[PDB]
């Protein structure tokens, strides 16, 4: 049910996909250590936002590791190409994991936007419902990327509706709350918005690869898009969220944040 199963792979194609995923693992787990160490310089009000980046680093890192091992489990080099041995690799495992990681990405945004109490809980609930609707419909849609491309497109259209509503909530909360933000992070958070719009849109482009490049090189392109998108939406994003957290902490008078930025 996945286009990966349709092709034999050259060593170059197969090993490049493996190296992309392994590089992704190393980037996420290196970033994890950074987020862990700097969390002590974040004030209590914001510290969960940096903890959430640690959670996302390990959760996404584990899925990228799992995809890499599944990839090498599923194929063997036979007669000059990597040939399918087991019908077990699928990008669908990424979608299941997004059910956890996308809420974490959204929640750490809400924390540095200074949302509290009922608004934080209400906003998180609606964002997570929209995200889950997007993920579930996209997951069903990619089950058909071989058998029924029309069905892939229609589930993709429904998923995109959820995506667009989710992004409207995200953008509205960012632009309505950037005046609360301290230490110049009213500017920084605007760039976070655009980083999200760019990086998250790479995922529906990857989803459509079976429709516009259904060959072994499109399989590579999709893994490349996922890799660009993962590093941008989780690592670069998380570094920006943590910068905003530490900068607002120092502006609020948290001494460890002030001393950390002074060094
Ligand atoms: C770290 C993982 C992230 C930020 C994943 C984000 C995923 C999406 C924005 C997925 C979007 C989709 C659509 C807009 C339509 C096609 C189906 C999806 C689920 C791939
Ligand atoms: C006013 C408090 C917001 C409650 C949750 C709103 C969730 C939808 C956000 C739409 C843009 C404001
Ligand atoms: C304040 C404007 C920041 C814009 C950042 C660019 C991210 C989106 C560019 C997409 C162009 C294809
Ligand atoms: C070997 C190709 C690497 C692909 C992943 C690079 C991620 C780029 C995201 C933005 C980096 C500044
Ligand atoms: C394969 C190891 C990749 C390490 C990249 C370093 C990323 C820096 C994150 C702070
Ligand atoms: C797309 C096939 C792989 C699916 C991964 C596991 C999904 C189980 C929950 C629906
Ligand atoms: C307060 C209502 C905001 C609309 C959120 C829509 C998300 C779709 C989830 C079903
Ligand atoms: C210092 C932590 C980096 C761990 C990278 C592990 C890559 C398999
Ligand atoms: C007619 C093509 C529409 C495709 C919509 C799918 C978007 C992910
Ligand atoms: C992608 C939708 C952006 C919403 C911007 C709303 C500004 C108040
Ligand atoms: C002293 C550590 C500062 C960390 C800033 C976070 C974003 C780079
Ligand atoms: C990387 C271990 C495989 C399970 C993925 C959560
Ligand atoms: C405000 C519209 C954002 C568009 C992102 C592609
Ligand atoms: Cl992920």
TrEMBL record:
Its membrane topology is listed as: Multi-pass membrane protein
**Database matches in InterPro entries:** Arc/bac/fun_rhodopsins
Location of this chain's protein in the cell? Membrane
| Species assigned in the record | Nonlabens marinus S1-08
Q: What is its main location?
A: membrane
Please give the PANTHER family that the UniProt record associates with this protein. BACTERIORHODOPSIN _OPSIN, NOPA (EUROFUNG), PTHR28286
Q: Which Pfam families match?
A: Bac_rhodopsin
Q: Does the keyword Membrane apply?
A: yes
Q: Which family does it belong to?
A: Belongs to the archaeal/bacterial/fungal opsin family.
The name on file for this protein is Chloride pumping rhodopsin
Q: Name one GO cellular component term.
A: membrane
Q: What SMART domains does the record point to?
A: Bac_rhodopsin (SM01021)
């Amino acid at each position: 049910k996945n286009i990966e199963s349709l092709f034999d792979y050259s060593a170059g194609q197969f090993e490049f996909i493996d190296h992309l995923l392994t590089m992704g693992v190393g980037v996420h787990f290196a970033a994890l250590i950074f987020f862990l160490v700097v969390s002590q310089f974040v004030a209590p009000k914001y510290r969960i936002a940096t903890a959430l980046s640690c959670i996302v680093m390990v959760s996404a890192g584990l899925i990228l590791n799992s995809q890499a091992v599944m990839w090498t489990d599923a194929y063997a080099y036979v007669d000059g190409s990597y040939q399918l041995q087991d019908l077990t690799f699928s990008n669908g495992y990424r979608y299941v994991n997004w059910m956890a990681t996308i809420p974490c990405l959204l929640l750490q945004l809400l924390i540095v936007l200074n949302l509290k109490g009922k608004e934080l809980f209400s906003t998180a609930t609606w964002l997570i419902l929209a995200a889950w609707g997007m993920i579930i419909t996209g997951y069903v849609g990619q089950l058909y990327e071989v058998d029924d491309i029309a069905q892939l497109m229609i589930w993709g259209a429904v998923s995109t509706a959820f995506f667009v509503v989710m992004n409207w909530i995200v953008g509205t909360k960012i632009f309505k709350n950037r005046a609360t933000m301290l230490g110049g992070t009213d500017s920084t958070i605007t760039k976070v918005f655009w980083l999200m719009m760019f990086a998250w849109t790479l995922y529906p482009i990857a989803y459509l690869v079976p429709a516009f490049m259904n060959n072994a090189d499109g399989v590579v392109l999709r893994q490349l898009l996922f890799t660009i998108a993962d590093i941008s939406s989780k690592v670069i994003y998380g570094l920006m969220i943590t910068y905003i957290a530490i900068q607002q902490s120092a502006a609020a008078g948290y001494v460890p944040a002030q001393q950390a930025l002074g060094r």
